[PDB]
Amino acid sequence: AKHLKFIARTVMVQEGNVESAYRTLNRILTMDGLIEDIKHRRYYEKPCRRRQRESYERCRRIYNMEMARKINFLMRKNRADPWQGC
Amino acid sequence: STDFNDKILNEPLKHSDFFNVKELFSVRSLFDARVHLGHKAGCRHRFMEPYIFGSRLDHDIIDLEQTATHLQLALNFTAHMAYRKGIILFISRNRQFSYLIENMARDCGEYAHTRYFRGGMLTNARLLFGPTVRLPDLIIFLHTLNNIFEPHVAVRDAAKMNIPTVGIVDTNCNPCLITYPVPGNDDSPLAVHLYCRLFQTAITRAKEKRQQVEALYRLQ
Numbered sequence: 001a002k003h004l005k006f007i008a009r010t011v012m013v014q015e016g017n018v019e020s021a022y023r024t025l026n027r028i029l030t031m032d033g034l035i036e037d038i039k040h041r042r043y044y045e046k047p048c049r050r051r052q053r054e055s056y057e058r059c060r061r062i063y064n065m066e067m068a069r070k071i072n073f074l075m076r077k078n079r080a081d082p083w084q085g086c
Numbered sequence: 087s088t089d090f091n092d093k094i095l096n097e098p099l100k101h102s103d104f105f106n107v108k109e110l111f112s113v114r115s116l117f118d119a120r121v122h123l124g125h126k127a128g129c130r131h132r133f134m135e136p137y138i139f140g141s142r143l144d145h146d147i148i149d150l151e152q153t154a155t156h157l158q159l160a161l162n163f164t165a166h167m168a169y170r171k172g173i174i175l176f177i178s179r180n181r182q183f184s185y186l187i188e189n190m191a192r193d194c195g196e197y198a199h200t201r202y203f204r205g206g207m208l209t210n211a212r213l214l215f216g217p218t219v220r221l222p223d224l225i226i227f228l229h230t231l232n233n234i235f236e237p238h239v240a241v242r243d244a245a246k247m248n249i250p251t252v253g254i255v256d257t258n259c260n261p262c263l264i265t266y267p268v269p270g271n272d273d274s275p276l277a278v279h280l281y282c283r284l285f286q287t288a289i290t291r292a293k294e295k296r297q298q299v300e301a302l303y304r305l306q
């Protein structure tokens with residue numbers, strides 16, 4: 001309200017591909033967490049539910065990051081079997 | 087029969103090194119073969135600490151003095167068993183050395199099982215092979231771990247069936263049930279080749295000495 005307009009969350013379309021512009025804007029909002037924040041703020045998430053969801057998301061992120069680390073670590077071992085037959 | 091057994095089987099048991107296995111190796115040979123390199127300090131096993139000299143930049147170093155003593159004992163045991171004509175079975179799930187170990191077994195006249203150890207090969211042997219089958223008198227593990235970094239089930243089964251086990255135990259292995267552990271590097275081709283050559287030489291020496299002693303006794 002008290003800020004200048006058309007600076008925040010504004011993207012400029014390149015060569016007229018408004019679809020690309022909207023994809024870029026959507027990526028920006030998603031990465032900044034605005035889309036998820038709006039979806040969650042539609043209805044009031046009581047503090048206990050909010051805490052449980054935050055804890056669940058933290059555990060999910062820890063597990064996913066560790067599993068991704070394991071996958072990237074073992075990806076090299078997807079080579080062709082060197083000792084085939086024996 | 088009585089005198090024959092007394093002078094054949096029990097004669098070598100009166101000598102510290104009847105087959106002269108100590109000459110087959112030296113700490114320098116083990117070092118050159120890299121028997122002293124273990125896994126990272128994170129993979130270390132709690133029971134392998136007594137045999138680990140230290141940790142060189144998070145890499146374990148196996149005490150080759152203890153390796154020399156243990157290898158002396160293991161080679162002497164293997165030589166005595168081969169002399170007594172027991173069945174020696176070489177077990178290893180390292181596919182990099184399956185072919186080599188099979189060839190060594192065939193050359194030295196002993197047996198090898200480098201394949202997927204089916205459940206019951208030793209505990210269910212009578213049913214699987216036949217009621218009169220003869221189980222191995224000694225099992226030599228060139229790699230006491232299976233291909234998922236767990237102890238070979240043959241170790242537990244051999245302990246169950248009372249079959250003595252010689253075994254090369256790396257810093258991530260579990261030597262608790264291996265009768266004659268030989269702390270060493272089981273992953274370097276040089277080390278594995280040295281172990282194979284040593285056991286082959288000891289078994290061949292034992293068999294040829296058995297033949298020589300039998301000939302000496304029977305000719306008189």
Ligand SMILES: [Mg+2]
Nearest residue numbers: 256271272273
């Ligand atoms: Mg190893």
